[PDB]
């Protein structure tokens, strides 16, 4: 009774079609949902925004277990495929928007799971035009502002700060070496 193509499989499929076919990444980047298209959709939002917010973050109740590893693969593929700046700019812009959204989010384990998972996707992407874009968009400065948008007493705060330090170390190194 379970669906035979779980969202994990669909993500791996799209990661493969992105890695092979140039136009698919741009079509996925520009494609956006519409209000009341599904129970999980509240307003017009991008597929990348949905993958960053609802599928990428670890959440305690399963729908598919390994959706996040494969949304990470999907976003990695959509970055690595050079596709000039058509795909990469919308990926980076949406990652910055979802970071700022989760920082403005109210204090919750949903907030810390989103934040940690976005740090993990920035770190995997980071592992050069993507770095040029992260610099141009001020992503490093939005990572450094992360604790400004935390309650520094939270039991999650150290884990989300560790996560945000992980791309900061690599990025500061890659610049200043």
């Amino acid at each position: 009774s379970k669906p035979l193509m779980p969202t994990s499989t669909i993500l791996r499929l799209l990661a493969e079609l992105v890695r092979s076919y140039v136009g698919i990444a741009t079509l996925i980047a520009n494609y956006s949902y519409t209000v009341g298209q599904s129970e999980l959709i509240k307003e017009d939002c991008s597929v990348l925004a949905f993958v960053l917010d609802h599928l990428l973050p670890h959440t305690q109740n399963a729908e598919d277990k390994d959706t996040p590893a494969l949304a990470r693969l999907f976003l990695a593929s959509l970055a690595a495929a050079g596709s000039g700046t058509d795909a990469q700019v919308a990926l980076v812009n949406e990652v910055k928007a979802a970071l700022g959204r989760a920082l403005a989010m109210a204090e919750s384990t949903e907030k810390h799971a989103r934040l940690q998972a976005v740090m993990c996707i920035i770190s995997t992407i980071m592992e050069n035009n993507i770095i040029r874009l992260f610099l141009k968009k001020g992503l490093v400065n939005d990572l450094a502002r992360v604790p400004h948008s935390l309650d520094l007493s939270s039991p999650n705060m150290a884990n989300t700060v560790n996560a945000a330090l992980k791309p900061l170390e690599t990025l500061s190194r890659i610049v200043n070496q």
Binding site: K2, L4, M5, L13, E16, L17, S20, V22, G23
Partner: protein, 1429 residues
């Protein structure tokens, strides 16, 4: 013991616990589960005593008891949890159900108060300080998650009700009120001294528990050392808590040492230790509390166990004070315990310095204390050859461990000579002489101190003999009873290895008959607990094996003992024979543990004989006639029936095998055969039947045994059953000695079995085999619930004596098992003997074994049989027995055995058993038998076994190619060719007699499949054997198709064997016969399809239900059972005959009919999905697979045609690729011509030889493999019936049908076939667009896991790629692939070196790598490669 007396006394209880297991611990767990929900003091006493019990179900209650206002119980719970974490990892292994709630309450107790830096140093926490010199935040609560309370005194009452009132006044986080409660009860405590000290002590316990299992900081050690310095002396419990914490912290050690000061004689810890010791010694100075002194000496132990601490204990010179302790301390139990602690510390310190100890005469001090303690035992137990208090025994034990270690240590090698001229031997003499007052491990330590000394200075063995210590050891280890334990038994031979060392010692040792006494251990129930396997994971008899290997080392040091050792071994065996022979003993699983004796003795003898592998012990043992007492142990009357399968019989077999394989001696087999012949001659009454309407002899010997409650336990009550189970044990020994790979042992085994005695035994074993098959099948016929017999008194007359059904069955079952297990062991024996015979006396062994095969196949029951099933069940196991004996695993025959099976008989009897089974003795002809209504019940099972045997017997590819061939040369020479002539001629008639009749209820598809395999082998074989009756196989191949299609209607799974039969009839006959077959199969499909096309016209008039009937009529009509095999057959035929069958499938037009049927079934399937009762027609997958392979075949023929258009048919140059030079080097002309001819024939691989190296080409991969090295190298062919294929109007309909079958999720295997077909079709983007315009990706996403298969996600990904790859995107991706392959020196499975620069870069190789891209689209691939290369 006295523990049990204490339990009975308690079960005033609390007053007795104040004075001071399962149900007493359960009463304790009771009151634990009671108090947490004249009470508190009972809980406190229960805990204070349990903290002694653990030191030699409560947890969930104790955790709740941590929620106490009175810290006394928390402290006692902590002391118990410390005793736990100290001793065993019981709370470390626990699950997080309570390990975390526990450890968190402990953390909340333990967590810091601010230390010195905030005015909360532990020193200041223990002195009163007036309560005004502490930080004002001490009597203050500040609990946050917000609660703050300046002071608790104006509400000082009831801190528990304070916490509950705060529960009501604020919502305190749930399940975490403990950190609040501990802060609040602390702030009540800190006002006063006792509660502040109790909080300190609880915190120190909690620390220590958290370390035996964030809390620690730089000031903690300094605080603890300042607690130890506090000199009000009312703090000794806080000092002991601080020492036990420091102990936990050892497990920062340099800081502990820097603070405590252990690096110097003057220093707080060393001085404190010396004052403790002096106070313990001298009565005037009051003695430091027992607890504190124990914590000090435990800290010294744990500190010494680490190198930094042992070096510190060196530096402060504590050895002088500890030797002072061990010299001057008294005799009372506590002082003894401090002495043993000091000894264990002097051990840890001496593992890294000796000089201090030696300069302080520490060895003399140790020896004087051993003299004093032995002298204090001498009063209780003065006996010396001319219970000990546990603490003194532990002192002696630790001190003897020290002396043994010192003796094995240099820095005593100069001077240890003057140990054994001291008093030491006079006090060891007392320990050794009183192994029952002193424990056995202490008696062991004493004999091991002597052994290690005698091995360090064998010269002074003369002094130990002069003072008679060796003469006390001998008396205590031989004449006096040995203490029965593993370690003592394991050491006796090493001790004797010392005592023999002087030759005088050898004389004295051999004087007292040592082995008569030492080996009695193996026959004594007192030592069986010592022999039982430890940990349940070491081998059976591991301790007797150790003892035996040690006696082997002993008498290889001292060969003079060998003869007496083997005499005592043989006396053990003769006594086991005595204990097994007479009636008065009875083996327990008077009861006697005989089977354990036999396992232990045999592991002992095995170890001895097989230890050195020098065959000196085996020779001596065999020359003293020990093989008779050994081999008799198998035949012992009072051994149980289940003996032969036991590890004791496998042990005896292993000892026989060890003697055989070491000594190369026939005598083991000769004696086994003599005794087996003696036993077989006893049970000839088993061979003689009732000679009346009667059943089993075993059941007439049982039933006539009066009414004895257990006849089977008596050798007179059941003589034949006990001779059975003796013969079984001998047979399992002959099995074990045949399972031997030394060709010499094989030769002497065969020479023995070929003897006059060997063949007398083998004849009697053959008659026994047929008797046991009879008896077992009769017994099972009587244990069957009145079903097999025909309402007859066949064995009932004796069951009426035996006796409501089970009461008789459970008495027969020991007979049935004793006869069926023996038969299986005989069959194993004969199979092994055939193996040994094959690989002069072998020829007589094989003769007797083929006479067994003939006897079994021609055996006829007594004429009182009520039903033939007893013969059919005899025949089935005779056939299943003859199979292993004529043919190996991998089905190659033994030609010696086929020769003797033919000449002697058994082939004419094998085929006579078929005639008998069908005709029922001539009652019905064979041609009517199979189909006769009254055919016996087991005639299908017999024919399954017979056909499976004859399938092996007929196969030329094994019968001619068998490794086990006779050599080429007075004797009649065998021909496997004439064997196949006579066998195929005899088999064909029987198959005739089964060719067309309807199949049996069960065993009809195995019959059919083995019959078809026989026909295949015959049809392939006559072409090869006529090389070195043809019209009968011709007319058969003419008329066989009516039977083949009958088999396809009755037994679909045979279709693969029918395909193979048809292909062999085709390869016999011409294309004129291939066409006739294919057109007939196609006409069957045609009519079966057109009736289903007429079965699905839409139901306008409603005459039939039109819903359930129509939907399931498509799936269940007989025609729909035919198609599933007529199409599938046609498809298998197609796979072999690729192009003829394609041309027939084209020219018949059947493909249009199958497309029309696939179209017309979609309304039916859709309506079934709307009934929610879809049931997929199984015939759909054959049709989709046939279409798939039809268009696969046509593609390929066009590609091969245009490949031929570019080739010269003569000397097509094949070339092999040299990656190192990059050259396409040619083959020789003969090799090239061979490869070309075999490629043109369509063979998958071709063999050829170059330079005597063997090369093979694989045209699946186009690779030459060197057969010696496995090197795979690329090859190429040097370039210079047209199947139209599926038309657009068919493909359009197929795409629609595949989408509709995806809409209704028809079935997993049908989705796999339809998606495979879609994958082939959609490789043209026009049809991929059609497949994607029919909304198939939604259906595919909706598909549930009930409709999935292994390849689903790969295949779906390829399909989606086929939709995505339009001409332009495919072009750009092909550019990417071509560039990648040309730029990167890609590796391959052809040893094209990774990142190579010759081979990886040749156009002719790269085009081979890019072949998948050329197949994806050749036109686009040309355009791209022309533009990008």
């Amino acid at each position: 013991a006295d523990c049990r007396a204490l339990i009975d006394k308690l079960k005033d209880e609390q007053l007795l616990l104040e004075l001071q297991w399962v149900d007493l611990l359960d009463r304790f767990d009771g009151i634990l589960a009671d108090a947490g929900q004249q009470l508190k003091m009972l809980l406190l006493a229960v805990l204070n005593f349990t903290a002694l019990l653990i030191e030699y179900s409560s947890i969930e209650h104790l955790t709740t008891l941590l929620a106490s206002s009175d810290m006394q119980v928390v402290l006692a719970v902590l002391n118990l949890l410390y005793v736990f974490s100290k001793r065993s990892n019981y709370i470390t292994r626990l699950g997080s159900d309570k390990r975390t709630p526990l450890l968190t309450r402990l953390q909340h107790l333990a967590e810091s108060w601010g230390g010195k830096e905030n005015g909360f140093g532990l020193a200041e926490c223990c002195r009163d300080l007036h309560m005004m010199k502490y930080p004002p935040s001490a009597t203050t609560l500040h609990f946050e998650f917000y609660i703050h309370i300046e002071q608790l005194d104006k509400i000082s009452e009831s801190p528990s009700e304070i916490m509950e009132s705060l529960t009501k006044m604020y919502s305190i986080p749930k399940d975490k009120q403990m950190l609040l409660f501990t802060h609040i009860r602390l702030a009540h405590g800190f006002s006063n001294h006792r509660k502040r000290l109790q909080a300190v002590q609880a915190r120190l316990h909690a620390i220590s528990i958290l370390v035996y299992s964030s809390i620690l900081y730089n000031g903690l050690i300094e605080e603890l050392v300042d607690v130890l310095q506090i000199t009000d002396k009312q703090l000794m419990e806080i000092k002991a808590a601080s020492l036990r914490t420091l102990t936990s912290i050892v497990h920062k050690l340099s800081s502990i040492i820097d603070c405590t000061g252990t690096a110097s004689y003057h220093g707080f810890l060393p001085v404190l230790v010396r004052n403790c010791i002096q106070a313990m010694i001298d009565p005037s100075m009051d003695p430091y509390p027992h607890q504190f002194a124990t914590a000090l000496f435990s800290f010294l132990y744990h500190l010494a166990s680490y190198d930094a601490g042992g070096e510190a204990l060196v530096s402060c010179g504590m050895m002088e004070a500890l030797l002072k302790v061990i010299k001057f301390l008294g005799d009372e139990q506590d002082q003894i315990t401090f002495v043993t602690r000091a000894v264990r510390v002097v051990d840890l310190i001496t593992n890294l310095d000796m000089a201090a100890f030696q300069s302080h005469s520490g060895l003399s001090i140790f020896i004087y204390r051993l003299e004093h303690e032995v002298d204090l035992c001498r009063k209780e137990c003065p006996f010396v050859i001319k219970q000990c208090i546990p603490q003194r025994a532990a002192l002696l034990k630790s001190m003897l461990n020290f002396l043994k270690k010192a003796i094995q240590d240099p820095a005593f090698s100069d001077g240890i000579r003057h140990v054994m001229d001291g008093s030491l031997p006079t006090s060891l003499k007392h320990i050794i002489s009183n192994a029952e007052y002193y424990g056995p491990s202490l008696f062991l330590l004493a004999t091991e101190v002597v052994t290690v000394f005698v091995f360090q200075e064998p010269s002074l063995l003369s002094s130990l003999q002069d003072n008679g210590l060796t003469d006390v050891m001998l008396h205590a280890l031989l004449i006096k009873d040995v203490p029965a334990t593993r370690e003592v038994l394991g050491s006796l031979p090493n001790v004797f290895s010392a005592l023999c060392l002087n030759a005088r010692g050898l004389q004295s040792f051999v004087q007292c008959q040592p082995f008569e006494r030492l080996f009695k251990v193996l026959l004594s129930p007192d030592y069986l607990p010592a022999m039982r396997r430890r940990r349940s994971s070491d081998p059976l008899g591991d301790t007797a094996s150790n003892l035996g290997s040690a006696v082997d080392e002993l008498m290889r040091h001292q060969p003079t003992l060998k003869t007496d050792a083997t005499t005592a071994i043989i006396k053990l065996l003769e006594e086991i024979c005595n204990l097994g022979r007479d009636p008065k003993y009875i083996c327990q699983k008077i009861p006697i543990p005989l089977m354990d004796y036999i396992l232990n003795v045999m592991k002992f003898v095995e170890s001895i004989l097989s230890n050195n592998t020098t065959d000196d012990h085996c020779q001596e043992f065999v020359n003293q006639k020990g093989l008779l007492p050994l081999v008799t142990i198998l035949g012992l009357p009072n051994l149980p029936i289940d003996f032969p399968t036991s590890a004791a019989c496998q042990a005896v077999a292993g000892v026989c095998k060890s003697i055989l394989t070491l000594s190369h001696e026939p005598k083991v087999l000769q004696e086994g055969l003599l005794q087996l012949d003696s036993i077989l001659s006893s049970l000839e009454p088993l061979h003689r039947p009732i000679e009346s309407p009667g059943g089993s002899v075993l059941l007439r010997e049982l039933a006539c045994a009066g009414n004895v409650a257990d006849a089977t336990l008596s050798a007179q009550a059941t003589p034949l059953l006990h001779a059975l189970t003796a013969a079984h044990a001998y047979i399992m020994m002959f099995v074990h000695t045949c399972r031997v790979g030394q060709s010499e042992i094989r030769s002497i085994s065969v020479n023995q079995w070929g003897s006059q005695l060997g063949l007398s035994v083998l004849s009697k074993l053959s008659q026994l085999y047929c008797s046991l098959v009879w008896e077992s099948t009769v017994l099972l016929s009587l244990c069957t619930p009145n079903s097999l017999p025909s309402g007859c008194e066949f064995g009932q007359a004796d069951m009426q004596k035996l006796v409501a059904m089970a009461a008789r069955i459970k008495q027969i079952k020991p007979l049935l098992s004793a006869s069926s297990r023996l038969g299986r062991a005989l069959a194993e024996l004969f199979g092994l003997l055939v193996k040994l015979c094959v690989g002069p006396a072998a020829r007589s062994t094989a003769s007797a074994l083929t006479k067994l095969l003939t006897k079994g196949l021609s055996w006829q029951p007594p004429p009182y049989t009520p039903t033939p099933r007893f013969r059919l069940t005899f025949f089935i196991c005779s056939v299943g027995f003859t199979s292993p004996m004529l043919f190996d695993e991998r089905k190659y025959p033994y030609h010696l055995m086929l020769q003797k099976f033919l000449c002697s008989g058994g082939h004419n009897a094998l085929f006579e058993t078929f005639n008998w089974a069908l005709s029922m003795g001539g009652k019905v002809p064979v041609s009517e038998g199979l189909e006769h209504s009254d055919l016996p019940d087991g005639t299908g099972e017999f024919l399954d076994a017979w056909l499976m045997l004859v399938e092996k017997m007929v196969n030329p590819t094994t019968v001619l190619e068998s490794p086990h061939s006779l050599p080429a040369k007075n004797f009649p020479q065998f021909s496997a060719l004439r064997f196949l002539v006579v066998t195929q001629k005899a088999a064909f008639t029987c198959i005739k007699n089964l060719w067309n009749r309807k199949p049996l209820k069960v065993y009809g598809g195995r019959m059919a499949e083995s019959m078809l395999a026989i026909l295949c082998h015959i049809l392939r074989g006559e072409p090869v054997i006529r090389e070195r009756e043809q019209d009968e196989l011709h007319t058969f191949t003419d008329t066989m198709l009516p039977g083949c299609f009958h088999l396809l209607d009755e037994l679909p799974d045979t279709v693969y064997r029918v395909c193979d039969l048809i292909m062999t009839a085709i390869k016999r006959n011409g294309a004129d016969y291939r066409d006739m077959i294919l057109k007939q199969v196609v006409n069957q499909v045609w009519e079966a399809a057109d009736v289903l096309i007429k079965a699905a016209l839409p139901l306008t008039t409603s005459d039939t239900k039109t819903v359930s009937e129509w939907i399931s009529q498509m799936a269940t009509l007989p025609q729909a059972s035919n198609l599933a095999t007529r199409i599938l057959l046609l498809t298998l035929l197609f796979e072999e005959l690729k192009l003829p069958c394609a041309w027939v499938v084209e020219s018949s037009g059947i493909l249009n009919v199958l497309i029309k049927l696939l179209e017309v079934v979609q309304p039916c399937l859709q309506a079934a999905k709307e009934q929610k009762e879809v049931q997929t027609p199984k015939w759909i997958t054959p049709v989709l697979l046939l279409i798939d392979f039809y268009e696969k075949t046509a593609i390929s023929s066009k590609r091969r045609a245009q490949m031929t258009k570019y080739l010269q048919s003569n000397s097509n140059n094949w070339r092999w690729f040299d990656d190192r030079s990059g050259r396409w080097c040619s083959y020789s002309a003969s090799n090239n011509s061979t490869i070309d001819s075999a490629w043109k024939s369509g063979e998958t691989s071709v063999r050829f030889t170059a330079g005597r190296r063997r090369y093979t080409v694989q045209f699946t991969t186009m690779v030459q493999v060197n057969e010696e090295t496995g090197n795979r190298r690329p090859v190429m062919l040097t370039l210079l019936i047209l199947i139209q294929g599926l038309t657009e109007d068919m493909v359009t309909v197929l795409i629609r049908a595949c989408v509709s079958m995806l809409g209704v999720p028809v079935d997993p295997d049908t989705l796999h076939a339809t998606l495979r077909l879609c994958l082939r079709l959609t490789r043209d983007h026009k049809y991929a667009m059609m497949f994607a315009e029919l909304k198939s990706t939604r259906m595919i996403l909706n598909l549930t896991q009930s409709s999935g298969f292994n390849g689903f996600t790969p295949l779906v990904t390829l399909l989606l790629r086929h939709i995505i790859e339009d001409p332009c995107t495919l072009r750009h991706t092909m550019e990417k692939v071509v560039r990648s392959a040309a730029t990167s020196g890609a590796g391959s499975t052809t040893s094209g070196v990774v990142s190579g620069s010759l081979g990886s870069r040749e156009i002719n190789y790269i085009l081979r790598v890019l072949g998948p891209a050329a197949c994806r689209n050749p036109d686009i691939f040309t355009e791209v490669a022309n533009c990008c290369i």
